[PDB]
Design a protein around this nucleic acid. Structure first.
Lengths: 59, 51, 121, 166, 136, 102, 12, 60, 261, 225
RNA sequence: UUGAGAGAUACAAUUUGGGAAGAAAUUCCCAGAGUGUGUUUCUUUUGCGUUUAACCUGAACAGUCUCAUCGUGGGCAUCUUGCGAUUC
């Protein structure tokens, strides 16, 4: 519904990560999202048609 | 009849003459009322006693 | 909770929380026990929703005592958390009064739900 | 099924001009008696109550707000109980047959207490109301009453006494 | 907010004055009186003075029937008409103050915060619909 | 008497089965032929037929109880209407303050 | 299609 | 005659004539109210059988 | 179904569900197979079109000497199928009226025949045939048995509330009727009227009192059986036939009595 | 200022600058609910026809209003002293009113006015069980009824059988909404008066009290046997 | 032209009860009913009532940026002269 509305919560602790997304990550109007099954790799697609790709370096 | 009144009324329950003159001319109403002499409001200092 | 007279069933509380949601969007409800009593004493209530979950329920059931004085419909819903979510606040909300407007968009929904409230009285 | 055919087994037919036949299925259905209703009367439903060791009671609802318990001897009603809400659309009986559900036109399910002997019917309890007219009913046991309404829905009430959701 | 509070107390003054000024008044009854009689004789006559008892004076006004003075011709009726017109005037003033507090409070809700769109209706009675979004 | 414990026990045996001290001693003292008894209520089944009484309280006993309740204060006690009314509102106020908590 | 068993008539 | 006999017949048959602000209803008979259940609500019976003979299902 | 499902029932052990409505068919749903039972699955087992117009009512009885479902609808007849042999075995439609109680009677003199439907009697005479009269008696509300006198003199209508007597005059292409007041008749209910004479009538009441009018026969009571206290009308007088001061009554607990008048 | 005595004794019309219904006092001097008292040497408490029900019945017109200053009156629907105060003041100090209710939330105010008014006796058990207040009082000369339950006629018929003398009066207030909404109150009231005369009541009058209450009626009747 | 039933509503006459005056004949006053001529509301009733339509709803105002509110200047007095309300 609104621009940059995505949060990553960490469970079991259920405490939302505080350092991403910041106010300058180009999420856009996040309208779909998928984690990759192997590499630890977010792909977030928004209303203007742009899948942005992040790699979660823990994996 | 005290139980069926809202909490803001219970705040200003004593200061009706100040309340109703400050409402009938558009001034600022009192904030303490009869509840001013309670022990906690006595413990508070400043404008957080109104809080 | 036994002292929670009329308690809504699931379909009635579904439409009650939906009319709460769209009244809250149209800025046509006052949410809270003190604000609901203020709308009653001013006589600008369509109906009252209360939550049969406040752990002293005697912080509620005094506005039933003055809905029986002011012949306005009132109803109980099972959960204060769900009422807060439907009101559109971040807090659990104990009672909520839907205020009167005649040029409102959801006047028909408000009337249908308040009739289905006062059918079980 | 696993017992023999009792000698008091009768069939009750309610027509639409208001006459009740009673037939007996012994040797190809002999009609024992007829209980006629007069002008502008109907019978939308009826039910039997045989509490074990007492007389048979035949209740019927016409197109109106009444429950009529018939005395089978005279062919005359021994009770015309105006049910205290709505026009009656349906009726059903308890299991053990001490309560009598009627489902009304204004959406009430009214229970009528029967266990006072034949002849007497009491108002018992109007269940939690609704809007659409309840057109048909059934019981589970003594516990719940099921009712199909005229909005395309089926409500399940709990009429179990000394429970909190009565 | 403080001029809305002024208008609210004026409305409550007039509303209590309407209530306790109409409470001590006497309105005329209009009820379909229905009396139960025997088969055709009692019905087909004129119910011969069962509560009439004079078919001139205590017969058609039922605030006080009966079975057996300072300017009564105009001045007391003038005072009655004026107290009825007084509570009618309190009703006008209370509905007018109700409308102006409704408009003032609509403006007050409108200047708070949150997204909102200027809804225009059919005729031109504009409205405001707020975004479906909860308060943080 | 007008003793409050007797009044509370009276209203208790009224609201419940009625085999208390008063009706028990009355049924004891009347034991002559174990005759046809007319109890006030039919929910007092034990106080009607628990010991030696042809018990009947049904559909004309209400008519005779209408007559008896009509002419209590004229002749059956030695007291009058005002003693009946004052002890009755005393009983009512006792049971009211008992049920309605203070 | 009738009530034919060893059951009695309208007696018991 | 034939164009007014129903009006005369209901003139003899009806009860509760207006008498000013009042109305004089007639009481029913215990004979009737103990021989017969009351007449049907023709409105709702009309509703049900009109539904069962409605236009959507094409009765012959 | 193709349209509304007005009425439906089940059997004892809930292995079958039968259902019927305004599309004049009966559907049978089965859960007899042990796989269907342990999986709790119903199958639309079968379907029979045996009715004429509707089915607004259906019931089922199941004992060791009975398992049949009975149904009836807008066509006025009644139909009986077997329960466990629904799709397979035969059925039987009972006729639209089996007149155990009669509504039409003839008197040989004047060659005339009356019929009572609900609260009206229609009378016509033989020749061809001419419809000679009708009585649409509206103060009557519910009808029961009638009888016409020999010689066509007095007809009596009789219901479980009152009864009414009508003396007739043949005036050619038409008959002329006149009532007459009899208050014992208007106060007491009648079940059957059967004309001992042209003037004396024996009358059974619904409270089982026998009258002899225009007086009172003792009837010896039967020892009530448990089935008699179950069904409270088998010890009631069903029939009485009288010709020339000897009559017969019959109560349907298997007892016929004569009675001399 | 000038007081005219009504048809029914105990009831008065205080005419003048406002011409309104009024009764005597039995708690002298003080109001009970802030009601207006107009003294003329002696004291006079105004009955409000919207606040109560029997006052609206009087203001609409009853001829055989059996609430008379020489009788005793059974009252099934008070719960609080809004109208039994005035019924006491019109029945006078001679008699007795039996205010019988069940909901023990406003019975506190019923009892707290019954202390100052000994004409009133409180019964705090339900009017559908007269076998629970058998042993308190009986054979009233008139019953008033103001329950709005489904089984109105059953409640009032059983109270009339256990406690009402013959040729006494039943005044019953019927709300049509608590029996049958979605149909008009005229068929509701006619069905109710027939349901009343099925019992030992010959019904005399009814009236609808439209400008005082919505969809109510008062029916009066005599107790036959 | 609801095929019809039941209701409020003006006129024309005939009246019913309670009071006033007179010997009555009658007259005056008060509350109403019922009958034909108009207007009108309610319930089926057949062509068909629309069997389609309505209203809500999902991320549905806003680059020609949209909106709010407080101020300022001007136009309309040949009149939108502007309500604690948007006149442009």
């Amino acid at each position: 519904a609104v621009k940059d509305a995505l949060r990553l919560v960490h469970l079991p602790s259920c405490s939302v990560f505080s350092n991403w997304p910041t106010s300058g990550t180009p999420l856009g109007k996040v309208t779909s999202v998928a984690f990759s099954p192997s590499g630890g790799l977010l792909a977030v697609g928004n209303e203007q048609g742009k899948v942005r790709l992040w790699k979660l370096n823990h994996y | 009849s005290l139980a069926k009144s809202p909490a803001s009324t219970i705040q200003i329950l004593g200061a009706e003459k100040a309340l109703f003159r400050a409402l009938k001319t558009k001034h600022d109403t009192p904030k303490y009322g009869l509840l001013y002499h309670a022990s906690l409001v006595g413990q508070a200092t400043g404008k957080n006693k109104g809080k | 909770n036994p002292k929670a007279f009329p308690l809504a069933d699931a379909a009635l509380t579904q439409q009650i929380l939906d009319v709460v949601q769209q009244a809250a969007n149209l800025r046509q409800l006052k949410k809270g026990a003190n604000e609901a009593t203020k709308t009653l004493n001013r006589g600008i209530s369509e109906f009252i929703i209360m939550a049969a979950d406040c752990e002293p329920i005697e912080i509620l059931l005094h506005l039933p005592l003055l809905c029986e004085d002011k012949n306005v419909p009132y109803v109980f819903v099972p959960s204060r958390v769900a009422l807060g979510r439907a009101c559109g606040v971040s807090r659990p909300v104990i009672a909520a009064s839907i205020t009167t407007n005649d040029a409102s968009a959801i006047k028909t929904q408000i009337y249908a739900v308040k009739d289905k409230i006062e059918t079980l009285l | 099924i696993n017992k023999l055919t009792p000698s008091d087994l009768r069939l009750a037919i309610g027509r639409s001009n208001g006459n009740i036949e009673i037939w007996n299925p012994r040797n190809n259905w002999f009609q024992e008696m007829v209980i006629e209703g007069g002008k502008d009367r109907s019978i939308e439903g009826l039910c039997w109550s045989n509490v074990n060791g007492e007389s048979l009671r035949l209740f019927s609802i016409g197109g109106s707000t009444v429950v009529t318990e018939w005395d089978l001897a005279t062919g005359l009603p021994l009770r015309n109980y105006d049910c205290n809400s709505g026009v009656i659309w349906s009726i059903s009986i308890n299991d053990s047959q001490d309560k009598l559900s009627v489902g009304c036109d204004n959406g009430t399910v009214v229970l009528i207490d029967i266990s006072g002997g034949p002849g007497v019917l009491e108002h018992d309890t109007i269940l939690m109301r609704q809007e659409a007219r309840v057109l048909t009913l059934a019981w589970k046991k003594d516990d719940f009453v099921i009712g199909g309404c005229s909005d395309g829905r089926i409500r399940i009430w709990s009429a179990q006494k000394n429970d909190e959701n009565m | 907010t403080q001029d809305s509070n002024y208008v609210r107390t004026l409305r409550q003054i007039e509303l209590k004055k309407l209530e306790k000024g109409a409470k001590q008044l006497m309105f005329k009854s209009s009820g379909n009186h229905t009396i139960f009689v025997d088969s055709r004789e009692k019905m087909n006559e004129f119910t011969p003075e069962k509560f009439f008892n004079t078919t001139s004076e205590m017969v058609n006004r039922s605030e006080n029937r009966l079975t057996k003075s300072i300017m009564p011709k105009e001045s007391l009726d003038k005072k009655k008409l004026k107290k009825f017109k007084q509570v009618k005037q309190h009703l006008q003033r209370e509905t007018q103050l109700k409308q102006v507090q409704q408009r003032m409070d609509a403006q007050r809700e409108l200047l708070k915060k949150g997204s909102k769109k200027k809804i225009v209706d059919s005729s031109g009675k504009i409205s405001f619909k707020w975004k479906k979004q909860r308060k943080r | 008497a007008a003793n409050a414990l007797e009044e509370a026990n009276s209203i208790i045996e009224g609201k419940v089965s009625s085999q208390l001290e008063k009706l028990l001693e009355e049924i004891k003292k009347d034991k002559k032929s174990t005759l046809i008894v007319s109890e006030t209520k039919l929910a007092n089944a034990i106080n009607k037929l628990g010991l030696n009484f042809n018990v009947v309280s049904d559909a004309v006993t209400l008519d005779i109880y209408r007559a008896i309740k009509e002419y209590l204060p004229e002749l059956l006690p030695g007291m009058s209407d005002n003693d009946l009314s004052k002890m009755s509102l005393g009983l009512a106020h006792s049971i009211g303050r008992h049920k309605l908590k203070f | 299609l009738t009530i034919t068993d060893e059951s009695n008539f309208m007696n018991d | 005659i034939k164009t007014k006999k129903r009006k005369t017949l209901k003139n003899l048959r009806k009860d509760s004539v207006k008498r000013g602000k009042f109305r004089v209803q007639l009481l029913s008979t215990t004979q009737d109210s103990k021989t017969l259940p009351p007449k049907k609500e023709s409105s709702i019976i009309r509703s049900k059988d009109r539904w069962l003979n409605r236009k959507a299902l094409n009765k012959g | 179904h193709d349209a509304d499902v007005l009425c439906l029932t089940t059997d004892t052990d809930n292995n079958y569900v039968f259902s019927a409505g305004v599309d004049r068919k009966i559907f049978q749903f089965s859960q007899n197979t042990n796989k269907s039972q342990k999986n709790n699955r119903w199958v639309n087992s079968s379907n029979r079109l045996l009715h004429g117009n509707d089915i607004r009512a259906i019931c089922a009885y199941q004992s060791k000497g009975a398992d049949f479902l009975v149904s009836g609808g807008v066509e006025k007849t009644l139909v009986i199928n077997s329960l466990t042999s629904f799709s397979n075995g035969n059925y039987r439609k009972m006729p639209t009226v089996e007149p155990y109680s009669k509504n039409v009677l003839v008197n040989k003199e004047q060659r005339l025949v009356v019929s009572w439907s609900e609260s009206t009697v229609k009378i016509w005479t033989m020749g061809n045939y001419k419809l000679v009269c009708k009585l649409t008696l509206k103060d009557d509300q519910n009808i029961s048995t009638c009888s016409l006198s020999p010689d066509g003199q007095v007809l009596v209508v009789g219901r479980p509330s009152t009864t009414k007597v009508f003396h007739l005059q043949p005036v050619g292409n038409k008959l002329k009727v006149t009532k007459l007041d009899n208050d014992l008749l208007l106060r007491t209910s009648t079940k059957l009227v059967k004309f001992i004479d042209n003037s004396k009538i024996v009358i059974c009441s619904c409270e089982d009192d026998v009258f002899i009018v225009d007086q009172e026969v003792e009837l010896l009571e039967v020892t009530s059986t448990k089935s008699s206290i179950k069904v409270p009308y088998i010890n009631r007088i069903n029939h009485l036939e009288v010709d020339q001061n000897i009559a017969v009554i019959s109560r349907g607990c298997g007892v016929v009595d004569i009675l001399d008048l | 200022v000038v007081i005219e005595p009504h048809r029914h004794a105990g009831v008065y019309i205080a005419r003048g600058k406002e011409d309104l219904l009024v009764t005597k006092n039995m708690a002298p001097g003080e109001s009970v609910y802030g009601e207006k008292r107009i003294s003329v040497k002696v004291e006079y408490r105004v009955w409000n026809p919207f606040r109560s029900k029997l006052a609206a019945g009087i203001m609409g017109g009853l001829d055989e209003l059996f609430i008379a200053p020489g009788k005793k009156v059974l009252y099934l629907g008070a719960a609080s002293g809004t109208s039994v105060s005035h019924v006491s003041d019109v029945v006078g100090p001679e008699g007795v009113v039996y205010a019988v209710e069940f909901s023990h939330r406003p019975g506190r105010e019923l009892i707290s006015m019954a202390k100052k008014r000994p004409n009133i006796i409180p019964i705090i058990e339900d009017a559908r069980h007269p076998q629970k207040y058998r042993m308190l009082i009986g054979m009233v000369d008139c019953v008033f009824a103001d329950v709005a339950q489904p089984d109105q006629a059953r409640i009032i018929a059983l109270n009339s059988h256990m406690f009402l003398k013959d040729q006494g009066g039943v005044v019953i207030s019927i709300k049509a909404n608590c029996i049958d909404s979605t149909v008009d109150a005229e068929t509701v009231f006619a069905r109710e008066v027939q349901k009343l005369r099925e019992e030992r009541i010959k019904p005399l009058e009814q009236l609808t009290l439209e400008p005082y209450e919505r969809d109510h009626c008062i029916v009066v009747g005599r107790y036959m046997r």
